[PDB]
Amino acid sequence: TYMNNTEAICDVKGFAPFSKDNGIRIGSRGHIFVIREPFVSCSPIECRTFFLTQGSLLNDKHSNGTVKDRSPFRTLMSVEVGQSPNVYQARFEAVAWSATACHDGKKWMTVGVTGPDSKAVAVIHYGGVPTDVINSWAGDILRTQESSCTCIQGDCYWVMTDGPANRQAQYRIYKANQGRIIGQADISFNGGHIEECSCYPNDGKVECVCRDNWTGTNRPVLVISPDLSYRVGYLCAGIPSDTPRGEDAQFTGSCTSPMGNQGYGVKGFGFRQGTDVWMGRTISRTSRSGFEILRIKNGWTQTSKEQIRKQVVVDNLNWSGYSGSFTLPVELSGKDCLVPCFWVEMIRGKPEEKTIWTSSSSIVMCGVDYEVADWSWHDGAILPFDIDK
Amino acid sequence: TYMNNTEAICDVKGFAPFSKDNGIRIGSRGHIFVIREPFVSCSPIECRTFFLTQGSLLNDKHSNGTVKDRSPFRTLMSVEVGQSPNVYQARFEAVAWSATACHDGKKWMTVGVTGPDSKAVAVIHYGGVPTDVINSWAGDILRTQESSCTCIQGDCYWVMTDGPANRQAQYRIYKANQGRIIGQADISFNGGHIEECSCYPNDGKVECVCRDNWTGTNRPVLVISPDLSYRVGYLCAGIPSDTPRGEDAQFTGSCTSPMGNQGYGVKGFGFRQGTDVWMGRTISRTSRSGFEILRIKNGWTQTSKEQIRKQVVVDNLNWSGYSGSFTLPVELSGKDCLVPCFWVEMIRGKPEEKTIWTSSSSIVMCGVDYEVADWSWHDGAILPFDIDK
Amino acid sequence: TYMNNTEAICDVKGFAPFSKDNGIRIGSRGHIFVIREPFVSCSPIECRTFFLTQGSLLNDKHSNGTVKDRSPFRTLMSVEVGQSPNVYQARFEAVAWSATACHDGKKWMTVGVTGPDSKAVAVIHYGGVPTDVINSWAGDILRTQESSCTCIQGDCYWVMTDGPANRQAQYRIYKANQGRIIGQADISFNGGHIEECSCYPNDGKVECVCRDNWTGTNRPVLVISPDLSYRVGYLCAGIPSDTPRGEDAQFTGSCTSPMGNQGYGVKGFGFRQGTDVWMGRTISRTSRSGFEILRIKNGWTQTSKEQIRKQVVVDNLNWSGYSGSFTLPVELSGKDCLVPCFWVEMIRGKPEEKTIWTSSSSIVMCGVDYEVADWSWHDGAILPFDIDK
Amino acid sequence: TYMNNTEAICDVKGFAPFSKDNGIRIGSRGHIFVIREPFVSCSPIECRTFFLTQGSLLNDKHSNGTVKDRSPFRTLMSVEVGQSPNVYQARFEAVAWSATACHDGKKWMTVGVTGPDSKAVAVIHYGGVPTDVINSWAGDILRTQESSCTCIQGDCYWVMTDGPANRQAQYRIYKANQGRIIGQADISFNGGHIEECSCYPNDGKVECVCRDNWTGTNRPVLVISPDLSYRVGYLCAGIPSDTPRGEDAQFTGSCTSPMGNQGYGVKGFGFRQGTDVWMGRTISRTSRSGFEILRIKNGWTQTSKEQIRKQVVVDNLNWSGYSGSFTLPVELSGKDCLVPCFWVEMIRGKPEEKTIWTSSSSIVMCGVDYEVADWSWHDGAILPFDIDK
Numbered sequence A, B, C, D: 001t002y003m004n005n006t007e008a009i010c011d012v013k014g015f016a017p018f019s020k021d022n023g024i025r026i027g028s029r030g031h032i033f034v035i036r037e038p039f040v041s042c043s044p045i046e047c048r049t050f051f052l053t054q055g056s057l058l059n060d061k062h063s064n065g066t067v068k069d070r071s072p073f074r075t076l077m078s079v080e081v082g083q084s085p086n087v088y089q090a091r092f093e094a095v096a097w098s099a100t101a102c103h104d105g106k107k108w109m110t111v112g113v114t115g116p117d118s119k120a121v122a123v124i125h126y127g128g129v130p131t132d133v134i135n136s137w138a139g140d141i142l143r144t145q146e147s148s149c150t151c152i153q154g155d156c157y158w159v160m161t162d163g164p165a166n167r168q169a170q171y172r173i174y175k176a177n178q179g180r181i182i183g184q185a186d187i188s189f190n191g192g193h194i195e196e197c198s199c200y201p202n203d204g205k206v207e208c209v210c211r212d213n214w215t216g217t218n219r220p221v222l223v224i225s226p227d228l229s230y231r232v233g234y235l236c237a238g239i240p241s242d243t244p245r246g247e248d249a250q251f252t253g254s255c256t257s258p259m260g261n262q263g264y265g266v267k268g269f270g271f272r273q274g275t276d277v278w279m280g281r282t283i284s285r286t287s288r289s290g291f292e293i294l295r296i297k298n299g300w301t302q303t304s305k306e307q308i309r310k311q312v313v314v315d316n317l318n319w320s321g322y323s324g325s326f327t328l329p330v331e332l333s334g335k336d337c338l339v340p341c342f343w344v345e346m347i348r349g350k351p352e353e354k355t356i357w358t359s360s361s362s363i364v365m366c367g368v369d370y371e372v373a374d375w376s377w378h379d380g381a382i383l384p385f386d387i388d389k
């Protein structure tokens, strides 16, 4: 049976802790993959953490991080949410140095990108076997989102970028059924930049909050309809949520253009709430440290600066990183709306700390009907480690 | 299908060994979580051991026990009963430094408390996803039982405390269906103290034997009806079963008030048997060492001192700790009563032994129709360990 | 659905390798329980290896074998046949320093004996929970077989001994349905000795070949009918198959009495084949080294010395140990007879080798319609190990 | 339900990455079997990697590779495709120093060969238990293919060799249903040599591309019909694909005879594509390094040298090894043809590198409708390892 996912996103007043994997603390002694991107996606039976491994373990010499990001060894794997990315519980998914994954209600579909920068291949898997491919259309690091893709009534959707990471690139919507491409669309976005989209289903559409790695410190926003027509622009709110970024006071919002005139970025997310938005961001404006989520009244549709809620989940003394969106399937939450959820990656090691390696662990939060107090569910590993000596 | 759990508790003459996990002995070399509270709860398919981890492994530097009890890293996880709390067999349950869990016959419901002492959040999970929350109502370490909660005909019940741990606090009964709160009640108990309840279903009610951490060396007793009306008081028996406590000879029982005038305590349990009671306690009156279970004739309803049975399961040369109640589901035992069962936590390390760490393992016993001989199923680990050097 | 197991044992001309777990070789680096008695029993879905652990791992200090045989820590656990007794694949079964286990077609029934020598308790488990008990009836090390018990048409049968291990003891047949004792019988056997029976179903009866630890170098034989009437005696064959034992030439067989006048023994097995018997034994007459299986024509019913087949599975340069019987369920083999099968335990360490520890691994063989060549599937571990230094 | 496997092989323009296990990189720290032959075979539910272990782990002294190839310890085991051959995820299959395995749609059938060189035994397993045997018919190392066997409409087929490995030997087709031999055939092939066949189903027949270890640098080709009649010869293409071999320019193809006049070989594969063939081979003509797959137009039926496609998957700077064929079941791919797939073993250690041990890892590729760019998914382990010092 296909998941509908046609419902509204739940209006939430805050976010409750779902899981914490403690991967790096455990990896001090246990057998844990070195990873990045521990994103979460759910079937109607369970939620899983997906991740990119380098084929190496924490506290081992192969965790030497001199080896390139897009290596022959990178592979998408997964465990149940809350479990560490340990070897002995891991399900293999795809060969990938960039990835996305989602469930249509019957099976898991994953997409793994590997191969050379100049001509990469994305391999779509469905139910445990490859079913289709997408080759690089523009010859420059074909790449996906690094979070959950989005299945609505049996058809699944995701966004891909091919081209420069610090200039104008090319962006495409892909649609598949049962692991087979049934439609695609070019995203016209001159002046704009789209990387690493965080999507969720809402009102029968796919909504995505992405990363501008060119000039924007506000986040691009894509709203995809089932027929592949779309709306694209920026998160209207007059508060920047990318990193690096300037102060809130020095920012004017925009629904259409990138603002802030800064390079770089970090993958992030946001949730529409009628006309409001929940927006994640690191606490530091310059570093990937701390994590907070703000509700901006009318921030989805207006250049609003009306901040009505603020919740801290990782304090500014602690390293964060990537963040992404997913929803709880109706079959699991028991609700008649789509509970909005996010994961926060917590990066340990290089370049901020004195080790030969880099990994991350995660905390996952789910939208609830109540205000939830500030705290810090930080990584907690004690660095440096044994191999670092 | 919901479990009825409307049956009488079985009248038992003694207790047979169910399981022993040997976690710490195994953790000398294997990959085992450092834990506390290895409580047991059963679905109609199996019984699982739940536990609190600190995100660290035995024989690893992160097992340094200087890190606070209620830390960002603590997480409720579980394995099948008898298995060590090893990483590679563990199911993730909830972020929690205090917890309870039980099965309604369809799915597992768990409750995990985390967040700051002044404003803690309890996150209810049902079928693997968070479904509801309870925030601290009195601002002082919201906390649950650390043993199995209790599901009767599809509705599940548990007790929570918020407030001082050595003075008058506030106590509440919570009721949920399918992970959603459908009722609650304040427990009026002036002069009394309720911590860490050990509950079981009996005659269509929930009966709880708890821990008075204020002045009582006898144990408080709560009897909860489905409509949330209740009876609360103390275990009538003229024999104290908390720790620390005085000698039996210097004790007068009470059905209504705390007796003994001593602070502190340890989580424990008892089982109604008509008007008799089975009561667990450590053998030492001052230390958490040894474990014995006594049957007191008319000890549930009278200030009785008539001890008619005594069974030792952990000798006084060996460390014990927490103890808690659960029942065998009718679907598993094949009986028409609810087989009463308990677990005994066996704490190793600080503060009694010369190590940097603290963990525990467990032995689980189930009520049988026969007298069972004294023995000692103690932890057995050889301390100190490698990191302790 | 209950297994019938009412069929004839298959007539076989030899034995084919089923599995080898390589536990000790793997345990040089992996996380493997120290064990003894790796017996095999099958459900209609799979065959599992059961074993006794001491709660310790190979290459760890807790594997120090100074700790008593019948310790508080011993526990019955299991894995699928061919898998090493590693921690992370192990299913917990029972607290036990002596054990038996079998499947009735619906669930697993196990029996674990633990507690003090003077008053031991045997706890019967059914479907993962304890369901019944047997206390020591004669006060001297209550104990079972250490191999598969036997289920026929839903009722399961096993043999137990209580009393001296080197003199006249007491022996009993037990019968259970769904983990509940429904019948028992005393075995009258003056002059005889029964230990560690290896049973299988055949023609609607349970046949057992056991170990005389008193004076017999031939093996006692018990044939149990469903109503608990029985036939008891010795394996008629004029060839001794216990260890230690004398030469074949110096032996006269007996159907009724122990022959050989020697103490000690080793658990072993045999299979009726019409009037023939397959009999296992170590190759050495004095040591537990080597393993061979002989077919003696008319050896079940006559003092025959007519040896018609001989197959070696472990050469005399290599350590063996215990051996036991089980059958392939009809639902798995696809046959209309009960394929006879055995396991050979291979003991490494003390007292024969220079280590602080003792464990064993196994090879499992199944009866086939063809003559199978001699070879040696010995343990293969390289001793001593790391902790031994 | 039996798998049909009566469909045509899909015509493919190239091959997409399916999985990479990274076993040796992981085995630097994790608990990974030392293996060879990581072949892949699929049920309608999943694809598994099968492998031969020596009962030892990477980075352990038992991985000393002085121990013979056909040892008492070798055992066929399996994991899901993409997973490392780690202990704690491994399913035991058979005792074997040579093996094959395939799924008929209901259960797994495996065949494991063990025992002495002069009189080996092959034990057929079906659904987890041995069901039949084949003894050596010619007394000289009975042996199978080391890749997936082939099930068509419930009957499974495989090729076996018995006799010299560098001269004329004897070759046989075996056919089984439900693990029971129902037919066999001798392969008449004077002057020819057949080893280690790589088979797949195509048009209702089994097609096999094998290894001539006698004089052929081209590969023998066997086409088996359900009634055991067959066609046997050499891959017609005028391009040699065994290793060692000469240059392409110095080669004339043959449909009937071995060409090249060289000894030795390596297991390989090829796929019929109408009259074309996809042929795998190492890049080096003399070493097992690099891996490429070529499409030769009319190369199945003619001495063609018309190379129309070439795809590199392992570069010539990196070690390869064995390679083998399997297909995606229709139930998994969703197609109406049989997606052709292969695995490439990547051997690390002796004799090419300075270590005491030898293992391999793998990359698996599946046929797709698009041209896929050259890359190198090599093993990646950093040698030597810890025990090598």
Ligand SMILES: CCC(CC)O[C@@H]1CC(C(=O)O)=C[C@@]2(SC(N)=NC2=O)[C@H]1NC(C)=O
Pocket: A036, A052, A069, A070, A097, A098, A099, A141, A143, A146, A165, A195, A196, A213, A265, A266
């Ligand atoms: C701008 C996003 C992307 C463009 C190539 O680059 C990712 C940046 C980045 C980071 O931590 O900021 C980490 C990434 S996320 C990923 N898959 N691996 C990375 O190292 C970069 N992505 C790729 C495919 O190289």
Ligand SMILES: CCC(CC)O[C@@H]1CC(C(=O)O)=C[C@@]2(SC(N)=NC2=O)[C@H]1NC(C)=O
Pocket: B036, B052, B069, B070, B097, B098, B099, B141, B143, B146, B165, B195, B196, B213, B265, B266
């Ligand atoms: C009186 C029970 C409770 C009150 C805060 O304190 C627990 C005492 C205690 C002990 O071993 O005695 C261990 C506990 S049980 C638990 N969850 N962790 C602990 O360290 C204390 N509970 C909390 C939430 O901090």
Ligand SMILES: CCC(CC)O[C@@H]1CC(C(=O)O)=C[C@@]2(SC(N)=NC2=O)[C@H]1NC(C)=O
Pocket: C036, C052, C069, C070, C097, C098, C099, C141, C143, C146, C165, C195, C196, C213, C265, C266
């Ligand atoms: C004669 C069988 C039994 C009588 C107490 O003693 C077993 C002998 C023995 C051996 O290797 O010979 C090993 C055993 S088998 C087992 N369960 N553990 C052992 O150490 C002995 N059994 C007991 C319950 O102590």
Ligand SMILES: CCC(CC)O[C@@H]1CC(C(=O)O)=C[C@@]2(SC(N)=NC2=O)[C@H]1NC(C)=O
Pocket: D036, D052, D069, D070, D097, D098, D099, D141, D143, D146, D165, D195, D196, D213, D265, D266
């Ligand atoms: C020619 C194939 C076979 C003939 C005995 O010998 C295999 C050669 C070989 C190699 O890497 O080239 C490795 C093999 S494949 C295998 N099962 N083990 C090996 O060591 C050889 N096979 C046997 C049964 O010994």
Ligand SMILES: [Ca+2]
Pocket: A211, A212, A213, A214, A215, A216, A217, A242, A243, A244, A262, A263, A264, A265, A266
């Ligand atoms: Ca940016």
Ligand SMILES: [Ca+2]
Pocket: B211, B212, B213, B214, B215, B216, B217, B242, B243, B244, B262, B263, B264, B265, B266
């Ligand atoms: Ca107290």
Ligand SMILES: [Ca+2]
Pocket: C211, C212, C213, C214, C215, C216, C217, C242, C243, C244, C262, C263, C264, C265, C266
């Ligand atoms: Ca004897």
Ligand SMILES: [Ca+2]
Pocket: D211, D212, D213, D214, D215, D216, D217, D242, D243, D244, D262, D263, D264, D265, D266
């Ligand atoms: Ca050759």
